[PDB]
Amino acid sequence: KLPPGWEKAMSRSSGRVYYFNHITNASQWERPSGEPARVRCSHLLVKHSQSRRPSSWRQEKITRTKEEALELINGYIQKIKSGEEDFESLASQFSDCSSAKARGDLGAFSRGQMQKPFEDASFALRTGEMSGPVFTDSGIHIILRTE
Ligand SMILES: OCc1cccc2c1OCCO2
């Protein structure tokens, strides 16, 4: 019926149907639209105390909990979706990945090079699409597929 990994859901607060993708954790009101050797993605990483390496250019010792990291991620997604902030701007300022210096761009990559949840979300995103919170051993990601 729907592209890879989409399902119908129902808003608890409005009662209006929406669509959820269980690979990217994206959610939207519209019915989803419509695989390549490679995709190009940017990301914004929020690390937490259980991250593989709980350290970053922003903080020598990352101590926030994983729940706290998810709330930060959720807040960034809200401002990106409202257009109050750009993905690139928030990634430059707040991504715990040193790709913050490149507005979060990771360049292009094939299957097998990234952590599997990141890879699966990246390849399930349509070009221009953004993920919801994506969990890996690094932390929690917002992923933007640029190519
Ligand atoms: O293009 C990606 C990139 C750009 C700049 C810095 C980076 C980085 O990847 C992770 C390591 O730090």
Q: 2 CA distance to ligand 1 centroid (A)? A: 34
What SS3 state is found at 139?
Answer: strand
What SS3 state is found at 69?
Answer: helix
Resolution, rounded to a tenth of an Å?
A: 2.0
Residue of the CA atom closest to atom 4 of ligand 1: 99
Angle between the 87-94 and 66-82 helix axes, to the nearest 10 degrees? 150
Nearest of 121, 147, 132 to residue 4 by alpha carbon: 121
- Check if 22 is active-site: no
- Residues 114 and 53 placed together within one structural domain of the fold: yes
Q: Which residue range(s) make up the domain with 70?
A: 38-147
- Check if 41 is active-site: no
What is the number of domains present in the chain?
2
For residue 31, the 8-state DSSP code is P
Which CATH number goes with the domain that contains 122? 3.10.50.40
- Residues 23 and 86 placed together within one structural domain of the fold: no
Structural determination approach: X-ray
- Check if 141 is active-site: yes
- Residues 67 and 111 placed together within one structural domain of the fold: yes
Residue of the CA atom closest to atom 5 of ligand 1: 99
- Residues 18 and 51 placed together within one structural domain of the fold: no
Nearest of 98, 104, 43, 96 to residue 69 by alpha carbon: 96
- Residues 20 and 85 placed together within one structural domain of the fold: no
- Residues 67 and 116 placed together within one structural domain of the fold: yes
- Residues 94 and 132 placed together within one structural domain of the fold: yes
Question: Are 7 and 20 in contact, with CB atoms under 8 Å apart?
Answer: yes
Residues 104, 96: Cα–Cα separation, whole Å: 10
Q: Could you please report the per-residue DSSP string of 95-123? A: -SSGGGGGTTEEEEE-TTSS-HHHHHHHH
Mark the breaks in the chain: residue after which each occurs, C to N over 2.5 Å.
Answer: 34
With the most atoms of ligand 1 within 8 angstroms of its CB, the residue from 98, 138, 141, 146 to mutate is: 98
